[PDB]
Amino acid sequence: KTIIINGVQFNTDEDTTILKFARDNNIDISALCFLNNCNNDINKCEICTVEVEGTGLVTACDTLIEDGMIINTNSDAVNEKIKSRISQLLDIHEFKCGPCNRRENCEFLKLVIKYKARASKPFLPKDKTEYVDERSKSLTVDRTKCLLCGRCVNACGKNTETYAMKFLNKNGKTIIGAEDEKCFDDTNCLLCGQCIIACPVAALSEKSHMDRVKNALNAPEKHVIVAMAPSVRASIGELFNMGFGVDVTGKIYTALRQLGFDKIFDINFGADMTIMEEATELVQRIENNGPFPMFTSACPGWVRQAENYYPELLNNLSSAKSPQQIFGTASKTYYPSISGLDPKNVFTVTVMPCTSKKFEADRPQMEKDGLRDIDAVITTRELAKMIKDAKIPFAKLEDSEADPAMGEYSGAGAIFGATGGVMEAALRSAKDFAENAELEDIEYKQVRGLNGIKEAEVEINNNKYNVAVINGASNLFKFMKSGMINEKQYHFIEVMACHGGCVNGGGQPHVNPKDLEKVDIKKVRASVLYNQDEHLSKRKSHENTALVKMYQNYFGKPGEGRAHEILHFKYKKSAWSHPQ
Ligand code: 402
Ligand code: SF4
Ligand code: SF4
Ligand code: SF4
Ligand code: SF4
Ligand code: FES
Ligand SMILES: [Mg+2]
Ligand SMILES: [Mg+2]
């Protein structure tokens, strides 16, 4: 078919939208509410307006190309329409970029600047308290920034299929929020924060823990531990203009020391701990023939999904604590035993690509003897802001090293942040455990990649077992609802709520939609992790020397005794009751 765009003739067989055909041919069209191959069906932002000859102004993002269209993307009538829409958005928008947390990478600001748009009347609310919801342990809303673009609603729908983020009719006016405007925590919401990632502005954010951290750092008698997740070292460089897929591990350690932290450890150490315990439990369940299947339990997004939708699976969850919590538990017990610190004075902070980790850390029973496993969780974005506020030249920092005692990690722990990561690492140790051997082939490439549902057959000690990797919360629903779970007998199942794994977590750096169609963000971030695994000497969690010492000298044998006593956590379904 033949179309004309800005006087340029195209002959094409492609059946796509104006927007995508234009972007494919280096023709500029703006968009706002269009994301994840979806726009806002009930309140189209119309930022993507173009002029079609013989029709008038149309939305490019959801209008298919047709033979014989004459399209103008830059006529004065088009630009005045787009400018008008942005101005109306400004009319309901607290335009104060100064102290805003999206100041450095906001899509809306870029649009305002591009079209020179201004409000008819500035939005200047005196009392923000009614626009702000900070009840959640993981999420916050600032409706002074909200454009009602529906991108959070669509993303929540696509990524989780819970539809926990909804349009609401609050006293005759439209907002976004949880069901019945309740606290997100009190709904079926997973707190995975995929909504935040989709948000073009600062309307959706993580629940801040930065005050917890600063207060602890400035408290004389507090000994503040910090440990970052696998994914952080593969991501945080993005916010310092270092590009995508840059390993910045050593720079992070240096920055944390300069921030005033008293001990620099690593969650990857906790990852090796979780494998120690979970691979042990797997081997146990084999020689007890059940309960099968065993599900991973390190994703609090998935744990909440199970609690809210599949409580019959809670007893199938591994009882091993997550790397975050299992690390935290040892930081209040083992670490004092090798440091002399009063356990009460230890304050443990993690850096996570995740918002759901904050909820996990603040679970009432995630403590012992009055001591929280984890006292604070800051996202990748929060650590970045903290670094920038301290004016630490991150990109120029020299590499330092972590403190070894709870900072060493194997290549198995290092790949936790990728979908299929926990599966692969668990298998490397479960195999060696069950066969009493030191096997050389350790790469399970079949469980890797961005496929939503991944299965593999594995041969453990002259017996064959079935594993599955569930990549994304919506895929958990598909896997269960479509009866896939009953099509064969599964023995070990990994579930991550965020598609791509933690590298694509709700607390990660935002990425411009244009960059998203240019960079495979999930694969590129994960590539850093697998790279570290490939070039590390020890690639099994039980080959972690610092970890072995810890178990030999303090916890004893994994999966039992002291180790099972305090390094494990069991989820329980509510007892039957009526009503509901
Ligand atoms: N706790 C824990 Fe995990 C580990 O190790 C993280 O820290 Fe993850 C990452 N990156 C997060 O958030 S959680 C899910 N298990 C996969 S990776
Ligand atoms: S959300 Fe964007 S446009 Fe609005 S105040 Fe913040 S930086 Fe400025
Ligand atoms: S919270 Fe963000 S993504 Fe959701 S409607 Fe408001 S501006 Fe759009
Ligand atoms: S945190 Fe996750 S489940 Fe909850 S509303 Fe946001 S995207 Fe949906
Ligand atoms: S996949 Fe990772 S980042 Fe996403 S909710 Fe689970 S633990 Fe958090
Ligand atoms: S981007 Fe097309 S209507 Fe919003
Ligand atoms: Mg649409
Ligand atoms: Mg201090």
Residue numbers in the entry: 2 to 581
Task: Give the article text.
The strongest impacts were achieved when replacing E279CpI for A or Q, or C299CpI for A or S, resulting in activities <1%. Interestingly, the crystal structure of C299ACpI reveals that the removal of the thiol group causes an additional H2O molecule to occupy the vacant space. While the additional H2O is expected to rescue PT activity, it obviously does not restore enzymatic activity. Thus, an alternative proton acceptor has to be assumed. The additional H2O molecule (Wat962), which is trapped in the space of the missing thiol group of variant C299A would be a plausible proton acceptor. As it is well-positioned to bridge the adt-ligand (distance 3.4–3.7 Å) and Wat826 (distance 3.6–3.7 Å), it seems surprising that we are unable to measure any significant catalytic activity. This could be due to an unfavorable pKa difference among the Zundel-ion-like complex, the uncharged adt-ligand and glutamic acid E279Cp48. We assume that the proton is trapped in a Zundel-ion-like configuration with a dangling H2O molecule Wat962 downstream of position A299 that prevents E279 from being re-protonated (C299A).
